[model samples]
Target chain A: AIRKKLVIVGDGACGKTCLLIVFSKDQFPEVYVPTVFENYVADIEVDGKQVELALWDTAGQEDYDRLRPLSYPDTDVILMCFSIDSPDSLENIPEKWTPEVKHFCPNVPIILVGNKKDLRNDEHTRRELAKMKQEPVKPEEGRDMANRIGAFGYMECSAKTKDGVREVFEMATRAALQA
Target chain B: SMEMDEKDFAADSWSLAVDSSFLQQHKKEVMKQQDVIYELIQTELHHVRTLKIMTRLFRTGMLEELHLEPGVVQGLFPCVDELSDIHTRFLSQLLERRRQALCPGSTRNFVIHRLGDLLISQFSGPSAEQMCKTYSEFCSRHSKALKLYKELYARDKRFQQFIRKVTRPAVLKRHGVQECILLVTQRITKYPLLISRILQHSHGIEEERQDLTTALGLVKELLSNVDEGIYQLEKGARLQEIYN
Candidate 1:
């Protein structure tokens, strides 16, 4: 049996704790149980192989930012998480964390994921209106941000909805393993 | 080029008209809007005060005595829903008024402006800064204590199971007085985001806007300094062992 360890990394309150609880335990923890400093854990198995997953649920609070660098080290895989719909969370993933982690573990495989997809609703007229416009590309309406910064692949998953929650970690872990 | 919502602009114009002595012809409507704004601020301030007080008690050990209340967990988080909603919408309306003034009654661009002013006046005014600072300090200290308690429970085999049972599904994990303390600290973290959003949404406002920015910076720096103090007090000694 092969054991693969996955480290879940993200800003605080961006659902790192929630994603870990749902993925590791298959159920929500009673309380939020915020990762004040960090929660160091080991070993989650999928398909009879022992996966040594040392998931560090790091707090994203500005006050906790300095503590993050030392939270987890020499990790085999890093699951960089951001809320699906929040650009700030996604932006922070690269701007604040990616470079910091790379300085330590440059070879670490990074998987960018957007959690919380189920909350999106199909606006009745807005999407159609967007299709008819030529210059006001709806995507450009975004805070004047360039599109190149989006994740290698973007996904929308709602941990609360439990839709695609498992897939995010499983796929992210698998990708890290292969990388 | 920005489209504006017409009805809301008319409403705000109607409000300003009533406030101006020159337009005292709309005196009745102005008085009514003033009363509504005043009541909204009063209710929101009172609610924030109550939460702030509980936060203080939890941090300072005063809340330990009240932990036995049947609905203590829910009671601690009371008004969060209303508080967040009112805070958000109040800023939205204020911003709308500002937008209306700039673009001939287009309230859409500036809805958050009014809400910002409302929150600033209520929470970051000179009168409110002291209370906010006290709440910030209390949360920082209380969180340090909780971290110590969590580690001790994690080690003691007998108490570990007890801690699990009491903590399960507690809103924000009110497992013990310690959990309550940690929750307050997390709430304090959100203060920066809230005030920052309020200021960022405000544009073209004078005097009061500057006041909000100054007060928000004061509270933000105060809270950040307190966080470091608390972290230093508890660092790695308790939870630090878990990692070690």
Candidate 2:
């Protein structure tokens, strides 16, 4: 089993935690010890290979822009996440996230993850977005951001349907391994 | 996006928050003394927070949510409650002094003139006794706790299962029992360094220096006891291992 680091970076409440929850709920059955500083181990079989990803969460990173990189270290791959329902979250990726991640983990591969896809078409969310003069992020916009940031892969994940959950880590496992 | 939690480990945050002009008004040495006092208090607060998470977060979750027996929980977090009580009381005294010593008309900026008396009180008397005993026990039992924990988690399915559940993201935010026990041990060592720094900065009245020196000596004595306790603890555990 090879140990690698996978750090998640994005705006808070952009469904960053859902990634950990979905994976842990289904795949990681027991014990999620936050060992290895500001992080915990989330190991699973990916592509028929055992990849022990010490998953890093930006919990105490309230000022995720300045305070994030100061804690999470030696990241092999990063999930630059955003909520599809909140365009500002996506907008911040190029503005704040990419540069900081590059500055800190200069050579680390990144997966552009648009989380909360289940709400992308919900009338409940649609009504809220309409009030805010916004719309759920289009797939093209996510793909565009993925490319714009030189992301190794693009993914849309949802906690509601539990879709595209582990796939994100699979890509990250490959990326973490490849890196 | 960087190290948020460790920022308190260095620098007087209270000083950082205060105006430079007001600080500049004070003589350089006096400001240095003030700065070190601020650091002592801030680090104390951080220490309490560390102990807090151990009990309030980890201990409660293990006992209330996971329902692990008290014996195992106590085994894992030895002397943590005692340390928390001692440190919290000391922290409260420090905070109360800061409140009383606030600069005129200012709510937050504390211009505490002398901190030596409190240091003497804590390091020399009953406070010292309680801390010495608790820290010695915690430091000594630390390795045994880890060894016991590792064996249980690796060998016992139920223990591992409960640990994973109790330490879940919602139940407890971060750190394992092993990681937390290590934190307490490190904190005891950190206590001496901060006291030394405070002592070094105290170029105040001869009395202040003397008080701090006494405090430092007490801390040194406490640390020696902790060290000896750890040595004996390991020896006894190893002896038991030989028998087993």
How high is the CA lDDT of each candidate model? 0.46, 0.70
Worst 10 residues of 2 chain A by lDDT: A29-38
Best by DockQ: 1
DockQ for each model = 0.07, 0.03
lDDT of 2 by residue, A1-179 (tens): 78687878888768776567656655442222111122356767887999767676663344323223333445689999999989989999999888888887887899999999988878898898889888999999999999999999999988667789878888899998883
Per-residue lDDT of model 1, residues B1-244, tens digit only: 0124223323323334233443454344334433333323333333343343344434223234333343333333333333344344543455444455443343222222244444455454543544444453454344244454555466666445544544355232222343233333444444444455345434456664675587576656655554444432343457766466
Q: After superposition, how far is residue A31 of candidate 1 from its true place, in Å?
A: 26
lDDT of 2 at A67: 25
Measure candidate 2: CA RMSD.
Answer: 16.6
**Overall local distance difference test of candidate 1:** 0.46
Cand. 1 TM to true fold: 0.38
Output the lDDT of residue A169, model 1: 63
The sequence of per-residue lDDT tens digits that candidate 1 reaches over residues A23-111 is: 65544644222222223234445555555454544444545543334334446666677654455565686677677767776776666
RMSD of each candidate relative to the true structure = 14.5, 16.6
